[PDB]
C-alpha cells in the first residue's frame, strides 16, 4: 500500500510540471522521455515547493555510488603526488583527493598523512564518468575544519539506506540508547562506513556487536533490549 514501483512501470506525474529530478529516475538522452529505472517506492515531494516538485525512488543497495556533497569515510592507499589515492569501498574505484584541499590551505605546506589512515571527507566534485574527487575541508564547509583525519577507533560496514537513517533521521533510535550507556564519538560515512571511537575498546566491542546485529535485523523498535543485552554480554566478563 505505497507508491511502490518497478523499472518499467508507468511514471505517475504529468509531464508539464517543473520538477527537480531526484535519483532513481532517468531521462532519455535519445528520446527525451523520463522513466523510473529502479526498484522500490517513489516518494513524491509534496506541493508548494516553489511550484517545483521532486520524485525519488527508495531503492536498496550496499554498493555505494559516489555523489556530491556527501559525507564518506576513506582510506589512504597511495601517495600519487599533489593528490591522494584514496578508496571508499573495497573492489571499487579509487578516489582522488588534493593535497591542498585542507583547512589551512597552503601550497608550500605539504601535510602529513600516510598510507593506511582513516579520514573524514565530503565528496566535492564527481562526474558520473570522471575520476571522482572529495574534500575534507570545503568551501561548503564555509571555512569549517569539521572533517579531518581520524584516530584509531573502529569502523563497521552497513548498507546505505541504514546509513541515511543514521544521518538523515532523528527518529532513528540508535543514538539514543548508545548515549544511554557511555560517551563516545561517531563519524557517519555515506559509503556505508560507520566510524566509532569510545573511551573504551570494551564498550566499542559492545558498540560493535549491536550495530552488526541491529542493522542485520533492521527492526528499529526492537533495538532497545538488543542493544542493552550486549552490555550484559560485555558485563558477563
Amino acid at each position: 500500500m505505497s507508491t511502490f514501483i518497478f523499472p518499467g512501470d508507468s511514471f505517475p506525474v504529468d509531464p508539464t510540471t517543473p520538477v527537480k529530478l531526484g535519483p532513481g529516475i532517468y531521462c532519455d538522452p535519445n528520446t527525451q522521455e523520463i522513466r523510473p529505472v529502479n526498484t522500490g517506492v517513489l516518494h513524491v515531494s509534496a506541493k508548494g515547493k516553489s511550484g517545483v516538485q521532486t520524485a525519488y525512488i527508495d531503492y536498496s543497495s550496499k554498493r555505494y555510488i559516489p555523489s556530491v556533497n556527501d559525507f564518506v569515510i576513506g582510506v589512504i592507499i597511495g601517495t600519487f603526488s599533489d593528490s591522494y589515492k584514496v578508496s571508499l569501498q573495497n573492489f571499487s574505484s579509487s578516489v582522488s583527493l588534493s593535497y591542498m584541499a585542507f583547512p589551512n590551505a597552503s601550497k608550500k605546506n605539504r601535510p602529513t598523512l600516510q598510507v593506511g589512515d582513516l579520514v573524514y571527507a565530503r565528496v566535492c566534485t564527481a562526474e558520473k564518468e570522471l575520476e571522482a574527487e572529495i574534500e575534507c575541508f570545503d568551501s561548503t564547509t564555509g571555512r569549517d575544519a569539521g572533517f579531518g583525519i581520524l584516530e584509531d577507533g573502529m569502523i563497521i560496514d552497513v548498507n546505505l539506506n541504514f546509513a541515511r537513517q543514521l544521518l538523515f533521521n532523528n527518529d532513528f533510535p540508535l543514538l539514543k540508547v548508545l548515549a544511554a550507556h557511555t560517551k563516545f564519538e561517531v563519524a557517519i560515512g555515506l559509503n556505508g562506513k560507520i566510524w566509532v571511537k569510545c573511551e573504551e575498546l570494551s564498550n566499542t566491542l559492545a558498540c560493535y556487536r549491536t550495530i552488526m546485529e541491529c542493522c542485520q535485523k533492521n527492526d528499529t523498535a526492537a533495538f532497545k533490549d538488543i542493544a542493552k543485552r550486549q552490555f550484559k554480554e560485555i558485563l558477563t566478563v
Binding site: G8, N38, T39, G40, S93
Partner: protein
C-alpha cells in the same frame, strides 16, 4: 505455479538471489559496479562479464553458449549508459539440474534468466523494464504443447523452446521479445501458437513476481 524465490541471501556480494522453480535450484550472484580490468573497459557503456557454473563437471563449451545467449538478454535490461568505465561481474550457479545436461539445456536457460533478474533487484542497479522466461516443449508422440514440461516429457518432446519477453506498463505490455530459443523440429504454424500461450504465461509469471519483490523488500525498506 510451483515456483519460489529468495532475495538477499549472500553477504559480501551486491546482488544475490535463489530462484527455485519446480525441479531446478539455481542461485545467481551480482557484484557491481566495481573496478574493471584493463582489457575490459568501455569508454561509454557498462561492461558485463558473466560466469555460469554447472552443477556437475567444470566450465566447458556447453556452459559457454548458455552464458553467451544470456549475455545478449541482459544487455538491453541494463541502463548501460549509467555506468561508464565500470564493471559488474555477475555469476550464476547451477545447483540442481532438473534436466538431462547431456541431452538438454532448456530449463536452466529459462531458470538462470529468471534467477539473474532478481539478484539485480537485490543489486538495485539502473534497469529498464521487467522480464520473464519459461520453458516450452512440444511432445513428439502426442503432438501437443506443454508450458513448463518435465525431463521425461522432454524425452518424448519433439521440440524445446525458451521465450524471453520484455514487460512494461505494470509489466503488462510486451515491450519487445528478448530471446526465442527455437530448438527441435517446428514449422510456420506452431510458432505463432507457440508464442500465444507464452504471451500470456510469462505475464502470468510476472504477475506473481511483482507481488513477491515488494513482499521481500518493503520490510527491508524503511518507513
Amino acid at each position: 505455479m510451483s515456483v519460489q524465490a529468495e532475495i538477499g541471501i549472500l553477504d559480501h556480494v551486491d546482488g544475490s538471489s535463489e530462484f527455485v522453480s519446480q525441479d531446478t535450484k539455481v542461485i545467481c550472484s551480482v557484484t557491481g559496479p566495481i573496478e574493471p580490468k584493463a582489457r575490459q573497459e568501455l569508454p561509454t557503456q557498462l561492461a558485463l562479464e558473466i560466469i555460469v557454473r554447472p552443477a556437475k563437471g567444470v566450465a566447458t563449451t556447453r556452459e559457454k553458449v548458455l552464458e553467451d545467449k544470456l549475455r545478449a538478454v541482459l544487455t538491453p535490461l541494463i541502463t548501460r549508459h549509467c555506468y561508464p568505465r565500470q564493471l559488474c561481474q555477475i555469476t550464476c550457479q547451477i545447483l540442481e539440474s532438473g534436466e538431462d545436461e547431456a541431452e538438454f539445456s532448456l530449463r536452466e536457460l529459462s531458470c538462470c534468466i529468471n534467477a539473474a533478474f532478481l539478484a539485480l533487484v537485490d543489486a538495485g542497479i539502473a534497469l529498464n523494464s521487467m522480464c520473464a522466461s519459461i520453458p516450452i516443449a512440444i511432445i513428439k508422440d502426442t503432438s501437443d504443447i506443454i508450458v513448463d514440461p518435465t525431463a521425461e516429457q522432454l524425452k518424448i518432446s519433439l521440440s524445446v523452446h525458451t521465450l524471453a519477453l520484455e514487460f512494461v506498463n505494470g509489466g503488462k505490455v510486451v515491450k519487445n521479445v528478448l530471446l526465442l530459443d527455437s530448438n527441435g523440429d517446428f514449422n510456420e504454424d506452431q510458432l505463432f501458437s507457440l508464442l500465444e500461450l507464452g504471451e500470456q504465461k510469462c505475464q502470468e509469471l510476472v504477475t506473481n513476481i511483482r507481488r513477491i519483490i515488494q513482499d521481500n523488500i518493503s520490510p527491508r525498506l524503511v518507513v
